[PDB]
CSV table of C-alpha atoms and ligand atoms in Angstrom, one decimal:
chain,number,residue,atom,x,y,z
T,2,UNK,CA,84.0,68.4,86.4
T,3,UNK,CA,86.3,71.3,85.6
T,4,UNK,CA,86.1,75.2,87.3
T,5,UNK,CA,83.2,76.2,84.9
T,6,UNK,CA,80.7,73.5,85.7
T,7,UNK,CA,82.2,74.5,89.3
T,8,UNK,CA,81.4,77.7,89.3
T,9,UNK,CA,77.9,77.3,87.7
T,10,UNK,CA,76.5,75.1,90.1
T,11,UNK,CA,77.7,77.8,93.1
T,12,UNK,CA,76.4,80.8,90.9
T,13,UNK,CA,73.9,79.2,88.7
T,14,UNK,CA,73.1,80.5,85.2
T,15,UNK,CA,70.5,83.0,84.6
T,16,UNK,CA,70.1,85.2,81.3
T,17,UNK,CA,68.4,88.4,82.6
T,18,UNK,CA,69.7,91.1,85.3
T,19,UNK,CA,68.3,89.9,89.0
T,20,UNK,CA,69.4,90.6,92.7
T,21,UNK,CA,71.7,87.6,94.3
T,22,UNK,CA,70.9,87.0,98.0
T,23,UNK,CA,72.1,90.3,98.9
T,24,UNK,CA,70.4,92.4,97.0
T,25,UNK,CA,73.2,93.1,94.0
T,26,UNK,CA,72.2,93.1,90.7
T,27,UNK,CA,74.0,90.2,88.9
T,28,UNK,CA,73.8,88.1,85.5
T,29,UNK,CA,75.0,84.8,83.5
T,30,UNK,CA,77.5,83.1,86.0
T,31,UNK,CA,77.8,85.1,89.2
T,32,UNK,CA,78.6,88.4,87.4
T,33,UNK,CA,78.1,91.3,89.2
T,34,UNK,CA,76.6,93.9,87.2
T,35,UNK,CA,76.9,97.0,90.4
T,36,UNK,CA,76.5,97.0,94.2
T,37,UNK,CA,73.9,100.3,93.3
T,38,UNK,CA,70.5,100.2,94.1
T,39,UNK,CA,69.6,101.1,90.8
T,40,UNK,CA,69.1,99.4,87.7
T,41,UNK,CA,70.0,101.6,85.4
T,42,UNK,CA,73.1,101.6,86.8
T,43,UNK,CA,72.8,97.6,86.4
T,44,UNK,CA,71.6,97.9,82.8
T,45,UNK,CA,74.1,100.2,82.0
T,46,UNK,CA,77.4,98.1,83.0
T,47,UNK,CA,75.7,95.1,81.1
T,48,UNK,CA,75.6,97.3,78.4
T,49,UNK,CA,79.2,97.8,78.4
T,50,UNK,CA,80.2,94.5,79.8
T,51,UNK,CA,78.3,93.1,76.5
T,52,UNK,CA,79.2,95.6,74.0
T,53,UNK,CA,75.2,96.0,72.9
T,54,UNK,CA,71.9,97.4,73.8
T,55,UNK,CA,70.6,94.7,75.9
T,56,UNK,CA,68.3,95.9,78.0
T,57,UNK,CA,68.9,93.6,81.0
T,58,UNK,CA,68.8,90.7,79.0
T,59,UNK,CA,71.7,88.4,77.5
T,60,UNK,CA,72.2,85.5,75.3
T,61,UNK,CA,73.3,81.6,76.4
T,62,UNK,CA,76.8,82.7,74.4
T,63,UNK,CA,77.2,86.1,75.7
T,64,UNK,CA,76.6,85.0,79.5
T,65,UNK,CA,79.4,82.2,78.8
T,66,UNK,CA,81.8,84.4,77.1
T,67,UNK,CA,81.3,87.0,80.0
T,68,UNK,CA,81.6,84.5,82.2
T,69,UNK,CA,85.1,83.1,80.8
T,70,UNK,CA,86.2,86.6,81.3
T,71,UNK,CA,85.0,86.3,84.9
T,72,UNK,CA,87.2,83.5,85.3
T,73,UNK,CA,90.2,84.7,83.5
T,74,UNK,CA,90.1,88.2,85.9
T,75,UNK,CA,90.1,85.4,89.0
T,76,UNK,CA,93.0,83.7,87.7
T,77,UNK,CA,94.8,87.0,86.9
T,78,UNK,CA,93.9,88.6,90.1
T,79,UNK,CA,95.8,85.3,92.2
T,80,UNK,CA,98.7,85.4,89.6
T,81,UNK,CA,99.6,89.2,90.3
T,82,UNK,CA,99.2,88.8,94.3
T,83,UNK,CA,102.2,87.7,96.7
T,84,UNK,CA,99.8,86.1,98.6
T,85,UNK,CA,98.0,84.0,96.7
T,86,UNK,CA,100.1,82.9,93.7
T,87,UNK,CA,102.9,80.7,95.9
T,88,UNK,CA,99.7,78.9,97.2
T,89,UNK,CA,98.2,78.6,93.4
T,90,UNK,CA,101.5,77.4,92.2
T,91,UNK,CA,102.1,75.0,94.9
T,92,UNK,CA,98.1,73.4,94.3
T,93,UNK,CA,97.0,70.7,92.3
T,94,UNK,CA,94.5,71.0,89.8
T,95,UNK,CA,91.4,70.6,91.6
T,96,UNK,CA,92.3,72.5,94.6
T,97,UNK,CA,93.8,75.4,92.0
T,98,UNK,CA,89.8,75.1,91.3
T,99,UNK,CA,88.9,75.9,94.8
T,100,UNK,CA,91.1,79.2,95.1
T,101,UNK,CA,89.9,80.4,91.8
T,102,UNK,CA,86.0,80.0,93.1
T,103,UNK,CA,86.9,81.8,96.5
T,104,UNK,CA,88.6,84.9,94.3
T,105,UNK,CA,85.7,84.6,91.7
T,106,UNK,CA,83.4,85.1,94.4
T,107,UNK,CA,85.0,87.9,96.8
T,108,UNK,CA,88.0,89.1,94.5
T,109,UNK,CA,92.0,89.1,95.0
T,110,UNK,CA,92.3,91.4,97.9
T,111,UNK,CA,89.8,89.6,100.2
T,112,UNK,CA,91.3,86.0,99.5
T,113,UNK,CA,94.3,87.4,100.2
T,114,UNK,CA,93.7,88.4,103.6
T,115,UNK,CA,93.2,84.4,104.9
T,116,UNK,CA,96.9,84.9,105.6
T,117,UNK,CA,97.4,81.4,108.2
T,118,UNK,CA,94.9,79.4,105.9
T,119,UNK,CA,96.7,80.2,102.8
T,120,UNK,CA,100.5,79.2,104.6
T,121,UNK,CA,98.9,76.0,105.2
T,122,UNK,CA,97.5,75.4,102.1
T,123,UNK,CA,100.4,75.6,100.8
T,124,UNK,CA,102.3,73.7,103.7
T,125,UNK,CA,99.9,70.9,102.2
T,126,UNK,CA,97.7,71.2,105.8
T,127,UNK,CA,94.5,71.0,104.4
T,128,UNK,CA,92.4,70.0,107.7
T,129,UNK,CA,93.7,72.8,109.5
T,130,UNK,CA,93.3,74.8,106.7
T,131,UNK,CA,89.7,73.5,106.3
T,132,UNK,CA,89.0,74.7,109.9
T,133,UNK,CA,90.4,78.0,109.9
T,134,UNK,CA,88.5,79.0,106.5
T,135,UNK,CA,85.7,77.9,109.0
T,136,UNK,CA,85.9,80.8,110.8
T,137,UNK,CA,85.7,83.2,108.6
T,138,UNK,CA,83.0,85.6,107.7
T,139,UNK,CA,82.7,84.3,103.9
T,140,UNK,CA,81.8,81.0,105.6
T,141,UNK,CA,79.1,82.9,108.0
T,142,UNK,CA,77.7,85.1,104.7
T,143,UNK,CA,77.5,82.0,102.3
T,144,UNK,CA,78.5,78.6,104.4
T,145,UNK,CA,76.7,76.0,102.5
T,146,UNK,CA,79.2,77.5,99.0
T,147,UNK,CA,82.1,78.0,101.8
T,148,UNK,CA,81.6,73.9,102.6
T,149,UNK,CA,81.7,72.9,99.1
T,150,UNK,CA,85.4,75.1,98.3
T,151,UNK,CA,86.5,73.9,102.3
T,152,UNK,CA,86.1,70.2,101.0
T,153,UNK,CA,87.6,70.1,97.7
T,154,UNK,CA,90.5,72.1,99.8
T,155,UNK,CA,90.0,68.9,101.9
T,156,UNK,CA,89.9,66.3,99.9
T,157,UNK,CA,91.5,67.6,96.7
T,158,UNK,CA,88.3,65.8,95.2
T,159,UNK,CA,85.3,66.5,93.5
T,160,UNK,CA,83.1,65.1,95.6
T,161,UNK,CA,80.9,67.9,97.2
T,162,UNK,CA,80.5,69.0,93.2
T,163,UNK,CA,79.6,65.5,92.2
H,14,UNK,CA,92.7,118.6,108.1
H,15,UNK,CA,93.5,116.2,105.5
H,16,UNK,CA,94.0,113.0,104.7
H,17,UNK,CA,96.2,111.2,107.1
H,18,UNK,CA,94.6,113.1,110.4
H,19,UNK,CA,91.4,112.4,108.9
H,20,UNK,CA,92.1,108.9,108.9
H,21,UNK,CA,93.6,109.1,111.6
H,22,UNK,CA,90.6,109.8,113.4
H,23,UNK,CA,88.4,107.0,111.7
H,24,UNK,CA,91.0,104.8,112.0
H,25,UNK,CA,92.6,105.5,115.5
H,26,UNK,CA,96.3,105.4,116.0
H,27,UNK,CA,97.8,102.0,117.8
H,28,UNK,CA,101.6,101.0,118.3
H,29,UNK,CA,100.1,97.3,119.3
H,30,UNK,CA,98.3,94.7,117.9
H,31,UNK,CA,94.5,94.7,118.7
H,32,UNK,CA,91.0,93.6,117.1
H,33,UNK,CA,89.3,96.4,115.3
H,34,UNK,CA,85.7,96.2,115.6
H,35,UNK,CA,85.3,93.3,112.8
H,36,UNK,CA,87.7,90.8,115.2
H,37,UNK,CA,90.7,91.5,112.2
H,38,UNK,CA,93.9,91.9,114.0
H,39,UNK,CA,95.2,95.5,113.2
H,40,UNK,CA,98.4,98.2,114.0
H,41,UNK,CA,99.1,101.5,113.2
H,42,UNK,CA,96.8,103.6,111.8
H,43,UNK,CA,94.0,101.1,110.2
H,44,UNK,CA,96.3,98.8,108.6
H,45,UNK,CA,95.5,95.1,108.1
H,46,UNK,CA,98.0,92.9,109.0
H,47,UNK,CA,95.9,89.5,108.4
H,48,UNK,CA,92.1,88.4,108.7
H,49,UNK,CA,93.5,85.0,110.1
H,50,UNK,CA,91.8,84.5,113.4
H,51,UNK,CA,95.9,83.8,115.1
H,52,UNK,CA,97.8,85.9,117.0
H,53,UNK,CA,100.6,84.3,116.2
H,54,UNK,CA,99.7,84.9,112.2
H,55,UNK,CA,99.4,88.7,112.7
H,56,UNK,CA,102.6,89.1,114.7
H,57,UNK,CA,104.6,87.5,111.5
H,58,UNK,CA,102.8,89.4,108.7
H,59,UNK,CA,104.1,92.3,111.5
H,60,UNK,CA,107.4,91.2,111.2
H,61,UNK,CA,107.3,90.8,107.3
H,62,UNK,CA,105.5,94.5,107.1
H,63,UNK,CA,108.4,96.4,109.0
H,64,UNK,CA,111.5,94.2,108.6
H,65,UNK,CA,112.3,93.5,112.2
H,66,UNK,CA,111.1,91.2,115.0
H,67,UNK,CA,108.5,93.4,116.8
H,68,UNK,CA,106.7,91.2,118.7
H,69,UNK,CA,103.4,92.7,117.9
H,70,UNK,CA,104.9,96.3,119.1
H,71,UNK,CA,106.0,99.0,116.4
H,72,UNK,CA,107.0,102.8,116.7
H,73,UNK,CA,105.3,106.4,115.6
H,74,UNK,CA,107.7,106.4,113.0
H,75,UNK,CA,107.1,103.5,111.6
H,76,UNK,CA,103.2,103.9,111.8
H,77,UNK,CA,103.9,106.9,110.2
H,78,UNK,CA,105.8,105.4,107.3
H,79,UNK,CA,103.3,102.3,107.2
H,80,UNK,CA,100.7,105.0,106.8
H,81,UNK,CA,102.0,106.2,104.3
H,82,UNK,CA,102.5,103.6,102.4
H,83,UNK,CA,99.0,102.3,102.7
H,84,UNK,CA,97.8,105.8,101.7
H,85,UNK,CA,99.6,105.4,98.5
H,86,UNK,CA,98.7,102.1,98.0
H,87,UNK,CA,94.9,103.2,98.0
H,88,UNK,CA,95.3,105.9,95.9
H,89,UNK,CA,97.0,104.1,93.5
H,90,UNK,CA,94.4,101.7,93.6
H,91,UNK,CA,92.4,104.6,92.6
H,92,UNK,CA,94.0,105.7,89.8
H,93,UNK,CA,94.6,102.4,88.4
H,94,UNK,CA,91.1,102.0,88.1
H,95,UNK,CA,88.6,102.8,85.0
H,96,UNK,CA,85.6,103.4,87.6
H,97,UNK,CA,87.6,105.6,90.1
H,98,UNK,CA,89.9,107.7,88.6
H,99,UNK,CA,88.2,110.1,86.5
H,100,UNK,CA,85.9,110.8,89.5
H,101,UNK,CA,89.0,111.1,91.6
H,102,UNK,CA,90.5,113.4,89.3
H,103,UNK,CA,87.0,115.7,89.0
H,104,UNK,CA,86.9,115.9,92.7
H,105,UNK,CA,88.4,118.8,94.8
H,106,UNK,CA,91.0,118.2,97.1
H,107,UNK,CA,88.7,117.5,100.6
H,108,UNK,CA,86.5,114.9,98.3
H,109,UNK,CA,89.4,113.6,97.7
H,110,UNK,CA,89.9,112.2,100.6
H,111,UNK,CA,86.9,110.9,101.4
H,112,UNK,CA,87.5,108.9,98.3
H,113,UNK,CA,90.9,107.7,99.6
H,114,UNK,CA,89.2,107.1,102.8
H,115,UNK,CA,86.8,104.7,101.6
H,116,UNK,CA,89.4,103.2,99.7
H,117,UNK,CA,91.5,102.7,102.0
H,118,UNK,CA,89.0,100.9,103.9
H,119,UNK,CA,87.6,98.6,101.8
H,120,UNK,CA,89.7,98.5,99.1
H,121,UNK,CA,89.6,99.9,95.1
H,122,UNK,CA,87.2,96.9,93.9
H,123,UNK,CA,84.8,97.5,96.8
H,124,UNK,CA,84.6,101.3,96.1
H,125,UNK,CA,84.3,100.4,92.6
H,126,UNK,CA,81.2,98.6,92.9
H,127,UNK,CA,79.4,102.0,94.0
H,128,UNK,CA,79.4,102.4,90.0
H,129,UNK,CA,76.0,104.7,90.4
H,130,UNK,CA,77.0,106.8,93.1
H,131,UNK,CA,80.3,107.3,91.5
H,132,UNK,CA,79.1,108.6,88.3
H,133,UNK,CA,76.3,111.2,90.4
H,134,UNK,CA,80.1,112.0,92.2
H,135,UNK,CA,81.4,113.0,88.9
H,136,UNK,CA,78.3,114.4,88.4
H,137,UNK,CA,79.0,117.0,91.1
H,138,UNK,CA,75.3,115.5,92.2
H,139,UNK,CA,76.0,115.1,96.0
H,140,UNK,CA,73.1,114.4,97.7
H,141,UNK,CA,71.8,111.9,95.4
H,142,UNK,CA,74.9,109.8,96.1
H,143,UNK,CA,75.1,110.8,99.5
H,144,UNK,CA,71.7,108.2,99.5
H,145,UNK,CA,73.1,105.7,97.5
H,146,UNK,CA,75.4,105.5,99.8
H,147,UNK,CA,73.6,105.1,102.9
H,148,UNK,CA,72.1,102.3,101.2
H,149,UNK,CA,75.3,100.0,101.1
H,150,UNK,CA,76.4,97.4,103.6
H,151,UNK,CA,79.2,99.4,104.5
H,152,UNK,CA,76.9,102.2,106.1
H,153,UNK,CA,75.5,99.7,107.7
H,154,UNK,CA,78.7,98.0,109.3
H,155,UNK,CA,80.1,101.1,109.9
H,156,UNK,CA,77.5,103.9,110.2
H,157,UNK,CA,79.3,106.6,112.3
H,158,UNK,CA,82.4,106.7,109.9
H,159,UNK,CA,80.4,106.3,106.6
H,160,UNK,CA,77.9,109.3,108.0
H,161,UNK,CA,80.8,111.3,108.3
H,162,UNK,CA,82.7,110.6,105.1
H,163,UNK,CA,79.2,111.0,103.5
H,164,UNK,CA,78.4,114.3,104.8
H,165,UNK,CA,82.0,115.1,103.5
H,166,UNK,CA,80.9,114.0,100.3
H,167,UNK,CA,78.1,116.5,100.3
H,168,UNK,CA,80.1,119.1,101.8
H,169,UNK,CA,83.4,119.1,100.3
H,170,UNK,CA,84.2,120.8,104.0
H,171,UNK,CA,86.3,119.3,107.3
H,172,UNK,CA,82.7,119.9,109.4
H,173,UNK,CA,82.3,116.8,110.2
H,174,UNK,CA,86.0,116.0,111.1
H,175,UNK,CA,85.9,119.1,113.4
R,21,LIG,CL1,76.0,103.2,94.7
R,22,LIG,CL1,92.7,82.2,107.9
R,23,LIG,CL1,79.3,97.8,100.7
């Protein structure tokens, strides 16, 4: 189990444009394409995302290489924050996994703002830590993904990703 | 009218710690200090933000200069951005701000995600994102400020801040 198997099981993999549970358009792994209620708009990021005409429609390859450039913006985005890199740093592997999901999914800033979660993370408190994520809105907009990260924050395990 | 007394009036002006309407503890004029739900949390990130031990209580002055740095922080934001800035840059100086505004609320990614109502902004065609916009979740959580930093977009007049 690594962050890309991770990642695929909480986004799943699908080769043409389609709206995620709220209505954004979105493609390959969890990439979304525009918040617009338009697809053009949607076809035309993909567009430029891919680097081709591709009328709402990508390749195995291309929705893997866009989606390793997903990744790589997660990584960079807890890397250039105050916030989030002590925590990264101080995290093993598999909860480093766990940080990266939560910034793949809502981005740096909005991590970021789990200020008392994130101390305790890295103050190695992971059941208060657990609770307090808890509370959150991310848990109330997507709780069944939120349990998943919350326990391999928990557990420092790959259990709830078998 | 401008910027900072229009946010000032979305925002609201505060020299103590309180919940804005989302439960987030806040100070100043609209700035975050933490989404943790602790008290405790919000007065340290305080304490961090101006340097001193406040105790959840800051001064005008330093509102001010918090303010101001958040204001900068969000237009940076928007110039640092390949989605943003060239509509920033087309728009005239009262359009301006209700980019900064939105910005400043929900941060450059979030604004950036409007990609089809940004390019009819660029566009100069108002109306057509004016309902792109009431379309988003963010009219939704927040009508009575969006409606008005809509209506601004459509504009390009202080009307609705009069
Ligand atoms: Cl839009
Ligand atoms: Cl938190
Ligand atoms: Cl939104």
């Amino acid at each position: 189990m690594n962050i890309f198997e991770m990642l695929r099981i909480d986004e799943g993999l699908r080769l043409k444009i389609y709206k995620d549970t709220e209505g954004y358009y979105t493609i390959g792994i969890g990439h979304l394409l525009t918040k617009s209620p338009s697809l053009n708009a949607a076809k035309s990021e993909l567009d430029k995302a891919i680097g081709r005409n591709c009328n709402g429609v990508i390749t195995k390859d291309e929705a893997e290489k866009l989606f390793n450039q997903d990744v790589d913006a997660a990584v960079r985005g807890i890397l250039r924050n105050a916030k989030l890199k002590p925590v990264y740093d101080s995290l093993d592997a598999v909860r480093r996994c766990a940080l990266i999901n939560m910034v793949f999914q809502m981005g740096e800033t909005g991590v970021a703002g789990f200020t008392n979660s994130l101390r305790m993370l890295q103050q190695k408190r992971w059941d208060e830590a657990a609770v307090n994520l808890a509370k959150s809105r991310w848990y109330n907009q997507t709780p069944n993904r939120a349990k998943r990260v919350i326990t391999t924050f928990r557990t420092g395990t790959w259990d709830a990703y078998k």
